[PDB]
Amino acid sequence: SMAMFYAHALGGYDENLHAFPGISSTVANDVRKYSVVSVYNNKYDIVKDKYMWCYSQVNKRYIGALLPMFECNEYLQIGDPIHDQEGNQISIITYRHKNYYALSGIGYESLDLCLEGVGIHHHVLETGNAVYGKVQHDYSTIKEKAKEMNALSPGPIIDYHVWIGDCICQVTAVDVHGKEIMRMRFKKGAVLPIP
Amino acid sequence: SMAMFYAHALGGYDENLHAFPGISSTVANDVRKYSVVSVYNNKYDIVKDKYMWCYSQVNKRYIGALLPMFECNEYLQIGDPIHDQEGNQISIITYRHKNYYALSGIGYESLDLCLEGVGIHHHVLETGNAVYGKVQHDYSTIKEKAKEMNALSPGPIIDYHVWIGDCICQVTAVDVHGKEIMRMRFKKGAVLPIP
Ligand SMILES: Nc1nc(=O)c2ncn([C@@H]3O[C@@H]4CO[P@](=O)(S)O[C@H]5[C@@H](O)[C@H](n6cnc7c(N)ncnc76)O[C@@H]5CO[P@@](=O)(S)O[C@@H]3[C@@H]4O)c2[nH]1
């Protein structure tokens, strides 16, 4: 049947369709392979070695991922179809960070969460800072806190924290005492969308 | 260049572009002439003798008009193109009332307002009700109300009221005491959009 793309920001979420940041679609496009995309007969270049952390929270389901992004100085509307050079539609306009536009679909490192009972928060990780739990600081302070919190018994996860830095991205999970229960690292630099 | 359509609901109002209910566009399409439209390669019939009163409030400027509307049980997303039989985009999805979708552009009777210092309010005119000023009731109550308010000295207009009924549409303008200062009547039946 027809390849549909519904934007989550317009209420288009369908659990029976493939779900990506800001997109429910009938087909699952791998957008990692493209270096140039087109929007209304206009070609744009995919940014190399810099990505955009994009997420959408629908019902109690978090859908986050590191996505490719292309630069475009003109204003492009949410829902605008994105094509490849062969005429195929591969995505729609979703998220934006100044002159950068995310390319949503099957991308790079991703995170999916049941948000029932837990929260999630997003931070810009300042360069040079380490991360423990729900805080970011210099290595010495983070290191000493990790040893301090080490003597505590782990409680249940209550919050997730996403840290988006220019060279690394990390996700931590904390209990009620701020103790780090879990930590993932994505070895990519990225930016967050500007609403 | 290429014919562009921007949905007002997505922040795409441009005062230098043609402005219609929910649409800023580089072209001004007269949509009264169409009896069928197509969305996602599906043909839909324009309803005959019933319209939709659509409006958007952008830049303290009110833009309202009776628009043609077509019946579609499927879900169509705001901003998606509307085509004619020849494949040309003539409009975008804007407003909806259950299984009816507006066809915005140059439509039928219209109302433009400068919304600074004056208000506007929309009402469904219940069948059999009469209207005075900012209120609707049965004809007996309205007759008495009109007599009472006749004795009042008129003041400057501060509010507009749009009455959309199955047989007729009317706009009244009231002063601070609710006296009717102006009334226009459109000899068409219509419905209001449902968000
Ligand atoms: N190992 C590792 N793998 C990578 O892939 C990686 N990428 C970048 N870096 C950075 O290199 C520096 C040295 O790492 P490290 O010395 S092992 O210190 C880590 C951790 O051991 C410490 N910590 C957490 N929990 C406990 C606990 N229960 N007890 C004791 N210590 C704990 O908290 C610190 C968090 O710092 P961060 O990870 S955000 O940045 C790192 C540091 O700045 C990486 N490090």
UniProtKB/Swiss-Prot annotation, chains A, B:
Kindly state which keywords UniProt assigns to this record, in alphabetical order.
Early protein, Hydrolase, Nuclease
BP GO terms, sorted: symbiont-mediated suppression of host innate immune response
**Outcome following mutation: Q170A:** No effect on 2',3'-cGAMP cleavage reaction
The terms describing its cellular component in GO are: host cell cytoplasm
**UniProt keyword Hydrolase present:** yes
Which residues does UniProt call coiled coil? none
Outcome of substituting K143A: Complete loss of 2',3'-cGAMP cleavage
State the reactions this protein catalyses: 2',3'-cGAMP + H2O = Gp(2'-5')Ap(3') + H(+)
Provide the phenotype resulting from gene inactivation: Knockout induces a 40 fold decreased replication of the virus.
Write down the InterPro entries for this protein, in alphabetical order.
Poxin_vir
Keyword Hydrolase in annotation: yes
Marked site, Substrate binding, at: R61, I106, N150, Q170, R183, R185, K187
Protein induction: Expressed in the early phase of the viral replicative cycle.
Consequence the record notes for mutating R61A: Stalls the 2',3'-cGAMP cleavage reaction at an intermediary stage
User: What EC identifiers does the entry list?
Assistant: 3.1.-.-
User: Which enzyme class, named as a word?
Assistant: hydrolase
Q: Which Pfam families does the entry link to?
A: Baculo_p26
The residues responsible for catalysis, as annotated, are H18, Y139, K143
Q: Which GO terms describe its molecular function?
A: 2',3'-cyclic GMP-AMP binding; nuclease activity
Q: Which family does it belong to?
A: Belongs to the poxin family.
Q: According to its record, what is known about the domains?
A: The substrate binding site is formed by the N-terminus of a monomer and the C-terminus of the opposite monomer.
- Relate the protein's function as given in its record: Nuclease that is responsible for viral evasion of host cGAS-STING innate immunity. Cleaves 2',3'-cGAMP which is produced by host cGAS following recognition of cytosolic DNA and blocks the subsequent 2',3'-cGAMP-mediated activation of TMEM173/STING, which normally spreads to adjacent cells and activates the interferon and NF-kappa-B immune responses.
Q: How does it assemble?
A: Homodimer.
What protein name applies here? Poxin
**Source organism of this protein record:** Vaccinia virus (strain Western Reserve) (VACV)
| Gene that this polypeptide is encoded by | OPG188
